[PDB]
Design an enzyme around this catalytic site. Structure first.
Site, PDB file in Angstrom:
ATOM      1  N   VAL A  18       0.840  -1.197   0.000  1.00  0.00           N
ATOM      2  CA  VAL A  18       0.000   0.000   0.000  1.00  0.00           C
ATOM      3  C   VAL A  18       0.878   1.252   0.000  1.00  0.00           C
ATOM      4  CG1 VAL A  18      -1.897   1.192   1.133  1.00  0.00           C
ATOM      5  CG2 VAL A  18      -1.705  -1.281   1.318  1.00  0.00           C
ATOM      6  N   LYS A  33      -3.507   0.507  -3.212  1.00  0.00           N
ATOM      7  CA  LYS A  33      -3.303  -0.877  -2.782  1.00  0.00           C
ATOM      8  C   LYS A  33      -3.029  -1.765  -3.988  1.00  0.00           C
ATOM      9  CE  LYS A  33      -5.255  -4.050   0.536  1.00  0.00           C
ATOM     10  NZ  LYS A  33      -6.351  -4.176   1.540  1.00  0.00           N
ATOM     11  N   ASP A  86      -3.635   5.147  10.754  1.00  0.00           N
ATOM     12  CA  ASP A  86      -4.429   4.111  11.423  1.00  0.00           C
ATOM     13  C   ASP A  86      -4.426   4.319  12.941  1.00  0.00           C
ATOM     14  OD1 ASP A  86      -2.394   2.426  12.737  1.00  0.00           O
ATOM     15  OD2 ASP A  86      -1.841   1.760  10.731  1.00  0.00           O
ATOM     16  N   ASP A 127     -12.136  -8.557  10.576  1.00  0.00           N
ATOM     17  CA  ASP A 127     -10.796  -8.186  10.907  1.00  0.00           C
ATOM     18  C   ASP A 127     -10.680  -6.853  11.600  1.00  0.00           C
ATOM     19  OD1 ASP A 127      -8.252  -8.926  11.120  1.00  0.00           O
ATOM     20  OD2 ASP A 127      -7.681  -8.456   9.149  1.00  0.00           O
TER      21      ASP A 127
HETATM   22  N1  LIG Z   1      -6.958   4.856   3.091  1.00  0.00           N
HETATM   23  C1  LIG Z   1      -5.809   4.773   3.800  1.00  0.00           C
HETATM   24  N2  LIG Z   1      -5.206   5.862   4.339  1.00  0.00           N
HETATM   25  C2  LIG Z   1      -4.060   5.778   5.039  1.00  0.00           C
HETATM   26  N3  LIG Z   1      -3.432   4.612   5.268  1.00  0.00           N
HETATM   27  C3  LIG Z   1      -3.925   3.442   4.790  1.00  0.00           C
HETATM   28  C4  LIG Z   1      -5.169   3.455   4.008  1.00  0.00           C
HETATM   29  N4  LIG Z   1      -5.431   2.185   3.650  1.00  0.00           N
HETATM   30  C5  LIG Z   1      -4.448   1.410   4.167  1.00  0.00           C
HETATM   31  N5  LIG Z   1      -3.541   2.163   4.834  1.00  0.00           N
HETATM   32  C6  LIG Z   1      -2.340   1.673   5.555  1.00  0.00           C
HETATM   33  O1  LIG Z   1      -1.801   0.502   4.948  1.00  0.00           O
HETATM   34  C7  LIG Z   1      -2.262  -0.619   5.713  1.00  0.00           C
HETATM   35  C8  LIG Z   1      -2.381  -1.993   5.048  1.00  0.00           C
HETATM   36  O2  LIG Z   1      -3.464  -1.931   4.121  1.00  0.00           O
HETATM   37  P1  LIG Z   1      -4.859  -2.707   4.370  1.00  0.00           P
HETATM   38  O3  LIG Z   1      -5.969  -2.023   3.603  1.00  0.00           O
HETATM   39  O4  LIG Z   1      -5.078  -2.914   5.848  1.00  0.00           O
HETATM   40  O5  LIG Z   1      -4.600  -4.137   3.645  1.00  0.00           O
HETATM   41  P2  LIG Z   1      -3.538  -5.270   4.114  1.00  0.00           P
HETATM   42  O6  LIG Z   1      -3.553  -5.205   5.631  1.00  0.00           O
HETATM   43  O7  LIG Z   1      -4.135  -6.534   3.528  1.00  0.00           O
HETATM   44  O8  LIG Z   1      -2.218  -4.873   3.480  1.00  0.00           O
HETATM   45  C9  LIG Z   1      -3.039  -0.193   6.957  1.00  0.00           C
HETATM   46  O9  LIG Z   1      -2.537  -0.803   8.145  1.00  0.00           O
HETATM   47  C10 LIG Z   1      -2.849   1.309   6.947  1.00  0.00           C
HETATM   48  O10 LIG Z   1      -1.906   1.693   7.948  1.00  0.00           O
END
Ligand SMILES: Nc1ncnc2c1ncn2[C@@H]1O[C@H](COP(=O)(O)OP(=O)(O)O)[C@@H](O)[C@H]1O
Ligand SMILES: [Mg+2]
EC number: 2.7.11.22
Lengths: 296, 256
Positions: A18, A33, A86, A127
């Site tokens: 991400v 992502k 987050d 989750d």
């Molecule tokens: N819209 C967003 N804005 C800011 N940070 C984000 C956002 N989406 C994800 N992140 C950061 O990246 C992370 C990982 O992405 P996530 O959507 O949780 O999928 P995965 O955990 O499967 O990689 C999150 O823990 C967050 O800290």
């Protein structure tokens, strides 16, 4: 594709990365992502298929917004609105200070509104943990990471056993119930509520049995009176130590009587009696709720 | 009765109207017919049995297929590729354990390659715009079943059977919404087994009076009477089994 400049890598999974990124034409900042299809000889991962199809139907202030999907041969990109950070990072930054009570109440109220929306739309999140919750600078918090989410039927069937990060995992899952539902999401929020109040994970288990015992030691070992059917569950053992329920003044010292009452209803053992998101929103704990600005 | 239950029903009633395929789309298809479609769906029933997939997975695959064929012209030699990618996609959405792609290729007897099935999956995703969570006759049935206290399992197996038969024949059944098909199948299953009728509690919840189920009910009753004659048999064979209470062996009522 070519219209996004990658600013930084803000996250990682085995699925992909991400990035915080900027649209070069409009200036819009997004979270990007990336999901690898190429290492998939199975095509589009079911985790991505569920994440996208379910996010597209969930439109709500407290649920992260999916802006776009870019599906090529070798890769799949989900483009989300960007939020400051987050809740885990926020909690770590607040470890010394503490999160002001009016802010904890605001965040729980908002999380409950997003979750009630999910459930009214027949989606289980599965989750809910602080790193999957996103806060902006104006005092909003939103559910994110729907990669484990599922559309559920009324009534439910057996769904995937391995769901929810261990610390946030409900007891009916640990004890191996074939059926679970919306209550598992309420349990996770209960744990997150306590974690905000005390600045510490409520049940930091290092294994499934350890997780279970940490829960028992705090809430008391469940019996057939508080949880009818529990001794009949697949992973239940009659040899489990019997511990007595602690007083919540011990567990969440900072919480007032209304806060303790709500938390205990969110941590009820019997999923059938556990408070629903809709009902939680109507709890006296929220009568004064305001929307304060966080300090970042 | 959880307190989000009425919300879910209302939501699904709204989504079934948005996820509905074009009723007359087969006229606009140059090379394929209602009959080729029946052969495809029947074959998908057998694939579902071979892999022990959920009924829901079957109902979703059919929804995806009808919506895809609503905007896309397909030659008869590619119809099964569309159906196979539809089943793979419904499996990933619905199933705990989706069959791997190599298995879907095997179940077509190498009629298509892996690359083709994956590419068709991409095209189907694109055409449906990833909106995969469609209400099905199946989801409405399971909600209606809760109005039987105590549950009658034979009525349930019979309603499911009648609902699955409706998937085979696009003419007449594309004319009805999943919720209304589920209403007629439930009443018909209940009348057959207990001799009783569509409950007032369901009439209030759904808004369908017994009267409003009548057009679909006449159709469904005929389909039921003629089932042993129909050219596609896979659903009858499936519901002969004891797990379904062998409901396909029950004699339909002569009149309603
Ligand atoms: N819209 C967003 N804005 C800011 N940070 C984000 C956002 N989406 C994800 N992140 C950061 O990246 C992370 C990982 O992405 P996530 O959507 O949780 O999928 P995965 O955990 O499967 O990689 C999150 O823990 C967050 O800290
Ligand atoms: Mg995450």
């Amino acid at each position: 594709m070519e219209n996004f400049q990658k600013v930084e890598k803000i996250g990682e999974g085995t699925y992909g990365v991400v990035y915080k990124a900027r649209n070069k034409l409009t200036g819009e900042v997004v979270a990007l992502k990336k999901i690898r299809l190429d290492t998939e000889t199975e095509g589009v991962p079911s985790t991505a298929i569920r994440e996208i199809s379910l996010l597209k139907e969930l439109n709500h202030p407290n649920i992260v917004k999916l802006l776009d999907v870019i599906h090529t041969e070798n890769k799949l990109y989900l483009v989300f609105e960007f939020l400051h950070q987050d809740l885990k990072k926020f909690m770590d930054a607040s470890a010394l200070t503490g999160i002001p009570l009016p802010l904890i109440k605001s965040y729980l109220f908002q999380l409950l509104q997003g979750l009630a929306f999910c459930h009214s739309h027949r989606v289980l999140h599965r989750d809910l943990k602080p790193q999957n919750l996103l806060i902006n600078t104006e005092g909003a918090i939103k559910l994110a990471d729907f990669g484990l989410a599922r559309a559920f039927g009324v009534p439910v069937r057996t769904y995937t056993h391995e769901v929810v990060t261990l610390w946030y995992r409900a007891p009916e899952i640990l004890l191996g119930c074939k059926y679970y539902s919306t209550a598992v999401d309420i349990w996770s929020l209960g744990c997150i509520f306590a974690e905000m109040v005390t600045r510490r994970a409520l049940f930091p288990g290092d294994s499934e049995i350890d997780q279970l015992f940490r829960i028992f030691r705090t809430l008391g070992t469940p019996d057939e009176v508080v949880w009818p059917g529990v001794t009949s569950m697949p992973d239940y053992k009659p040899s489990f130590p019997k511990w007595a329920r602690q007083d919540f003044s011990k567990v969440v010292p900072p919480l007032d009587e209304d806060g303790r009452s709500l938390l205990s209803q969110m941590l009820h053992y019997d999923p059938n009696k556990r408070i629903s998101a809709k009902a939680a929103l109507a709890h006296p704990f929220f009568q004064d709720v305001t929307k304060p600005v966080p300090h970042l | 009765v959880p307190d989000y239950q009425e919300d879910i029903h209302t939501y699904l009633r709204e989504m079934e109207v948005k996820c509905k395929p074009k009723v007359g789309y087969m006229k606009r298809q140059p090379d394929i017919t209602n009959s080729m479609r029946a052969i495809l769906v029947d074959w998908l029933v057998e694939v579902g049995e071979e892999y022990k997939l959920q009924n829901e997975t079957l109902h979703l695959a059919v929804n995806y297929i009808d919506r895809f064929l609503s905007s896309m012209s397909v030659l008869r030699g590619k119809l099964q590729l569309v159906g196979t990618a539809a089943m793979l996609l419904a499996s990933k959405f619905e199933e705990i354990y989706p069959p791997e792609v190599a298995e879907f290729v095997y179940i077509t007897d190498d009629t298509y390659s892996k690359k083709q099935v994956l590419r068709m999956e991409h095209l189907v995703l694109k055409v449906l715009a990833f909106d995969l969570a469609a209400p099905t006759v199946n989801q409405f049935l399971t909600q209606y079943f809760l109005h039987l206290q105590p549950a009658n399992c034979k009525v349930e197996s019979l309603a499911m059977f009648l609902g699955e038969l409706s998937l085979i024949d696009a003419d007449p059944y594309l004319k009805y919404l999943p919720s209304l098909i589920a209403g007629a199948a439930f009443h018909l299953a209940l009348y057959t087994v207990t001799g009783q009728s569509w409950p007032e509690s369901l009439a209030q919840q759904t808004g369908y009076t017994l009267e409003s189920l009548k057009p679909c009910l006449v159709d469904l009753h005929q389909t039921y009477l003629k089932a042993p004659q129909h050219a596609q048999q896979s659903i009858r064979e499936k519901y002969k089994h004891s797990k379904y209470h062998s409901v396909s062996l029950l004699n339909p009522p002569e009149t309603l």
